[PDB]
Design a protein around this nucleic acid. Sequence first.
DNA 1: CACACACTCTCCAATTCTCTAA
DNA 2: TTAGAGAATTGGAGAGTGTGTTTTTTTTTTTTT
Lengths: 623, 608, 227, 268
Amino acid sequence: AGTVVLDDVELREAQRDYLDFLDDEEDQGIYQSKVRELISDNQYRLIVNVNDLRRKNEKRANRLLNNAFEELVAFQRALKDFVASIDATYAKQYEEFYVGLEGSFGSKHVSPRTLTSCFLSCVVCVEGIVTKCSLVRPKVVRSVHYCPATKKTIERRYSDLTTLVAFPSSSVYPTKDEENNPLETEYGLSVYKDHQTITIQEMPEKAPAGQLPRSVDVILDDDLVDKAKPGDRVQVVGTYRCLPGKKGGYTSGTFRTVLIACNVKQMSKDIAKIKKFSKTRSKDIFDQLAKSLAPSIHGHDYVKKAILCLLLGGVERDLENGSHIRGDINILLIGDPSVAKSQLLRYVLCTAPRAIPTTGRGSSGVGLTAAVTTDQETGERRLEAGAMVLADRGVVCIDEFDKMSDMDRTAIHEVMEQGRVTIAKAGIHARLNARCSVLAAANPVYGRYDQYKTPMENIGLQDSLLSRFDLLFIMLDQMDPEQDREISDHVLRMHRYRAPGEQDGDAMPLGSAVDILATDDPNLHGTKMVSAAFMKKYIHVAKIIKPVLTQESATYIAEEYSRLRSQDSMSSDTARTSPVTARTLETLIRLATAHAKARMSKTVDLQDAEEAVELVQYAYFKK
Amino acid sequence: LKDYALEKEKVKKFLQEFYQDDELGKKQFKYGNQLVRLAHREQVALYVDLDDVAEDDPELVDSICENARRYAKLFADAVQELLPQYKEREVVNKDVLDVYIEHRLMMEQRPAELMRRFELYFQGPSSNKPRVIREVRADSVGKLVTVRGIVTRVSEVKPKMVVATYTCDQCGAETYQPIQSPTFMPLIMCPSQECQTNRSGGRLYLQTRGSRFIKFQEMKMQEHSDQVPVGNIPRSITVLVEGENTRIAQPGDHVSVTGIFLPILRTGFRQVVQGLLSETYLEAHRIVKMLTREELRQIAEEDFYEKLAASIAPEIYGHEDVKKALLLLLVGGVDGNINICLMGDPGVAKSQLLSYIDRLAPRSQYTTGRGSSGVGLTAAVLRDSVSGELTLEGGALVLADQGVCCIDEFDKMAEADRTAIHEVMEQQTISIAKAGILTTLNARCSILAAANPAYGRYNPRRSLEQNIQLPAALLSRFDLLWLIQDRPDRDNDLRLAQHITYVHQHSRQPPSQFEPLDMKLMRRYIAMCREKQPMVPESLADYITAAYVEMRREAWASKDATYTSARTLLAILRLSTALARLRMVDVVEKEDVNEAIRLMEMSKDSLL
Amino acid sequence: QLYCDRYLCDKVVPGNRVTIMGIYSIKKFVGVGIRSSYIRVLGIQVDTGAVSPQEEEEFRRLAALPNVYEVISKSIAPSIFGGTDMKKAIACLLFGGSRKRLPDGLTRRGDINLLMLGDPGTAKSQLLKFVEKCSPIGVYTSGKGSSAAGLTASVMRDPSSRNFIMEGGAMVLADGGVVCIDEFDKMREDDRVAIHEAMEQQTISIAKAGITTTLNSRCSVLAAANS
Amino acid sequence: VIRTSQLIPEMQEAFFQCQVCAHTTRVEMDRGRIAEPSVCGRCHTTHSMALIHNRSLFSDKQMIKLQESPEDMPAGQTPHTVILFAHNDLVDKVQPGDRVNVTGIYRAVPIRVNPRVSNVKSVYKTHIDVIHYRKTDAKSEKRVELLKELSRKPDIYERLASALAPSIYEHEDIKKGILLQLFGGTRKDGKFRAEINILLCGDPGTSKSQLLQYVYNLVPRGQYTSGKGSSAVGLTAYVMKDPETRQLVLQTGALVLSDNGICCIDEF
DNA sequence: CACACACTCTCCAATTCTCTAA
DNA sequence: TTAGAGAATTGGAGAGTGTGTTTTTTTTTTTTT
Ligand SMILES: Nc1ncnc2c1ncn2[C@@H]1O[C@H](COP(=O)(O)OP(=O)(O)NP(=O)(O)O)[C@@H](O)[C@H]1O
Ligand SMILES: Nc1ncnc2c1ncn2[C@@H]1O[C@H](COP(=O)(O)OP(=O)(O)NP(=O)(O)O)[C@@H](O)[C@H]1O
Ligand SMILES: [Mg+2]
Ligand SMILES: [Mg+2]
Ligand SMILES: [Zn+2]
Ligand SMILES: [Zn+2]
């Protein structure tokens, strides 16, 4: 299995064309340079742009995309010739030199839904979300056996339906010499390669009306074996193949189809002068960012500031005694119906990196933390990460948080307190990392907030759980006519908006694979509100600043913490949303650190401490 | 690639001629001196160090690392061929296999792997940096690798057959079967020429007495949690351990294993089904685990009791009363546990005591009562469904067996766990059904509980069971019930904030202008003070009676006869004996009884 | 069981009424000589994604005439006497608003949710039964006979392969149309809180048994209830 | 002891009979395998001798699963366990929950990789062939002569009542009632119960549980259990699948197990 | 797939039948 | 009267063919909460 004969004349023609393409010396030297970097970085996969291959040789590019396997082995042989020409010593370190593909593939851009049987043997670029990974397991490609009786070494090389080779190959592991002597494997002299299977699922927002998302199995080998994990939105370039199986003298013509990947690309997070100019030119850049944060929602300025602090994050501290302080900031929104809690959560889902959606009734504790599932490749039971585990170093947005069961919230207790979840299931007792910020939205009991009841009975959650949240905002649908006028003006303006590429009578289209290049084709104030595209990059750069606390801001925070403690003392049992504790001090440090990150200051100043104290005052002392 | 015949002679030259200096510049042949012991059966395991091999042939080190198993076999063959050169004494036969080999040799005067009673292992070179489990990729198959990880499961030591010895019933001849594979075919009929030519029909009986076995032990290593990537599950690897490498490591041990990364061999239908794919294991070769005069002169200071109590929690002020009580928790009473419960509002430095005591305690755990999704307070069963074997995990109460277990949010404990706490506090064990069959686990541990009120802040207007919503059947088992109060207090809040801000901006405790005892000194002191086992003198029985009855009658006269019982006197005696242990005096005295009474009274004063 | 082939794949979806033309046949790779049967589909007639141009221009005419609103309202449940405002609101629910995505990525609902609440014998159930038949996409369910999983989406293991899969509920089956929830006051409160996200956000976020996703439920809720 | 299997019959001598001519022969067991006769002696038919199972000879065998003692485990470790095999008269001498010093031969046996193939795993299973059991948790006229005169000694009632539970401070009428409960009335026939029922009330932390545990240790056919649903053994009878066998068993509760004794119910 | 069991058939040669000499 | 050389029949060694295999979670429902 796996051995196929190819026509040598067209193989040599294709290899000539690809070697001409790679020998880029007389031109700009792009692929000369790239193969030099391949040698220099100790790599053995070259990523080629089919746009460049189309500019140089259009017919060879078309035949590459439509006749993937034979053309790819021709290209890889050409690459081995070229890398041998540059460095003959390096060329012998690796059995094979691989080529992955990027650029625009025309109609071969697909999703798992439109990836039909017509695309078999084609290069396809599939965009989707990773829903499963198998465990990385070695796969023998070439085994050396030493015959102790005869004192000679045989070497055998293998293939299967997955691994089409274009050279003669076996699929049986030998155990005896031709003289029937036993054979001893030379494991060190044998060659193995990493192998993993993943499942790519259709993007849910692009699915048709009544449909559930479809899936395609993908096979990753070599360097690609751990380039995508579950929850990643990815673009996989590969060859689409069927696997003709047989079962005891009989075959059902139904063959499973897999994408043998040749290239994997993430679709997230991917120069400094604009950001430096912004931080130096602007006064209180934190305010501009916060009010620019969610334009379609009017008001909620302090909640927007708090969410910006959640996005920027605090700094994670590990002490000499092993004690630990989290950097993540946790926010709870309790409020009346139709006060945009869900839309704020949806904004954070749309704009933050690794923001995981969750709702109270749609989720369970197992789905929140981790589940036992059986690897379909193997059959062994193993863990599969839940929402809060996937949200590590990210956000989990829990809407309808009051509707959740207490048994489900038991997991959230451990995740918020310690940044981990402990499990004992399958073969494994383990401590999974769940270092995620929580943005929770809830309704008060009785639906609408009651003015004639205390906040601690309007809030249906117990104080043990409420201690976990850094900030707790009460959002009330005040029926003030002034705020009603400006809010309704904003809402009707939003409902009057239409996009530029769209006609006046158009109904909203249902999604499709409109991304038709592996990289973005079109690529700081709005078209003085800050732009969303700029703000994503700015928050990305600001998250990693890691500013240090300064002594005068520390003194201010200590003074204001003790003053807030005195205010908690003088406050009645109806005039506070939460008591003031050492965790309130920790919240002040985290919020000041986030404000310092917003300024990209590298030092927490009194400017940061003032806004942190103001935000904590606003959140805590309300009724 | 290379000629292994020449490589064996190179290995012989290394083993014969390498030397190292150990003392006063004297020259010793570290491997010849061990070959002598191997020949005399004084030593069984020979750990050859490739850092030593590197001193005169790095190419041999590269060959060994890149094709380790072949070179392991070559080194074993070379050592076996060398031992007769180093023979100079007769062996004292102590294994029954020694006796059998002795009679085998005599009958031969009247199976190399069988005569081979030693085992050789590569101690890895320092140039090979230690990998994580996730980095042990397919390129390293068949190659010597060092891997760090957490031991999470270890099997019992089992006998692994190496050379099966049979005897024929008809011709009285011994037959030998070396066994390389994880499985083998037993021999049925005698292959000897005498039986075969005569068609005798004589069959073979396995002789375990004559066969060679080796200790065998499977384990599972797991990734370090902080080393796992952000969104990923921790990976795990099977390590197969043999001979003297067995029993080195236990579950929970941080280990570094130098070994050979190999694929698992399959038989029957697995090789048919799996195709080119294979599972892997690490063949273990070396497993590595990761006061009296001078400080007695310090202990002579009369401060030492308060010095220890101050060192039990230097970050907290005013609570020296509670720190002394928690000192007696760590010391324990005379045989004996001391159980303490702390009540207070959420978000108070009451979990600080749990953290500190857990950190200081030699054997300890620190869980929460809120229904863990992992192994809870009690044990649990794991299926390990690559193979399906059920295995039993301990949990908090079992893992803190001969020490102290800290339980946060003790009030939210479910009834299924409260009954287990009853089992621990009554008879110091727990019981669990593994597969319908019930097994019993030790838990001889002191419980440090921290509860919160069921709703809102603490309220002295209500009774304690009304505040905590936990029955008296739980609350009466404890020896000290403390209310860890927290009120706003301007200067104390300022100092706490200054302390925490210093901790944030410097990643270190601020200078407190006090020198607490270091943690290791405290541990050595508590061991030295708990080694004592004091006794109460009978002349003090009347005074103990007087103190108990007057405390009882004060509860009658001034607090509506709030609950007390004979376990109050027993708790006072246990506290006074713990104080006697702490003072390192083998007789309990008036001061011990007075301080125990005072401790109980001030705990109740904190409640009131 | 139906076997579809080449262009008959994805020609229909669950909920479609069809007339199948096909070969009744056994699979050919409880009892001994038992063979499993199926229909090899050779043609599909969806009983009722395309309008002929004659229907198209007639629809332009029908939209063009000035009293189209009144004509539609009189067409809603013609066997029901009265209730003209209710029929008009039902027409508005059938046609729906316009769904929008704003520049910051936030979505605004387009579908219209309508609750009929009150006295018995007032033709509420007849209006639901009309709307379920008149809407291009429409499902009818009783509030008593429904659950949270069966309304939004359910998670279950497949006997053919031991893995957890999703199965659509009423909201998923009616995505793009109307769910007619009769007896809406009778459903349990824990089941009733399931549809809040699917009503406003028009999404169903599931995180159960390791599978974590957000399905679409862009459907109107037309509910009937008693006092 | 953790578990004890059902009685396993081990064949000791195989009885063969010819299905053509009814001629019989007997074969001795060779280390666990039979030398089956391929031909008959009386007649000469091949493959005609059939094993007559219930004319063959058997001996008793039993598997026992034994955990290391709690007093012997190292600190905080999960217990190790071994398999014992007892035969003949030592089979039915040990029950689950017992603690024993077992002397036996430490055997090692192969295990076949699957039941229809004779390949065996290189790693051997081990068990102990039991040679001797010694239980280590077990704790007439010469008594009757004492008891006869002690019964007519004065205030023997008070002496016995004060003998009940010396470890607690005295409640005279409680101890007297428990004594009369222990002795009971006379059972006669119609339907009147000779059994005496006693109830103790008080706070948690009183000596009532100590009284219960004491008299449970004292009386024959006694039981001790909790009225709480978390009890080790239930009060009511129930039916369950025997997990090691999968067959149903009627677990009669403590009230039925104490059919001629005292049932102590804590947390009533 | 592939490595052990389970079963049948064929050929080879060893034993017994028949005829002859010691 | 014994037994030995040549021919025919029966025992069984072995060559060839065919078969079988490697606790967990979400949801319902009645009763009991
Ligand atoms: N201040 C506001 N500005 C703009 N739109 C708003 C505002 N408040 C509410 N809305 C709109 O009202 C609709 C409902 O908002 P939503 O996000 O559901 O608030 P909510 O409080 O989470 N609803 P609920 O889940 O019942 O509490 C959305 O279309 C919002 O855009
Ligand atoms: N205005 C009406 N015109 C015609 N039939 C009507 C009218 N009102 C009620 N009916 C009839 O009354 C019967 C009940 O109708 P139905 O749709 O169940 O009303 P309902 O309000 O849903 N009843 P209920 O479920 O108890 O609240 C049907 O047979 C209808 O045809
Ligand atoms: Mg909402
Ligand atoms: Mg109705
Ligand atoms: Zn023999
Ligand atoms: Zn016979």
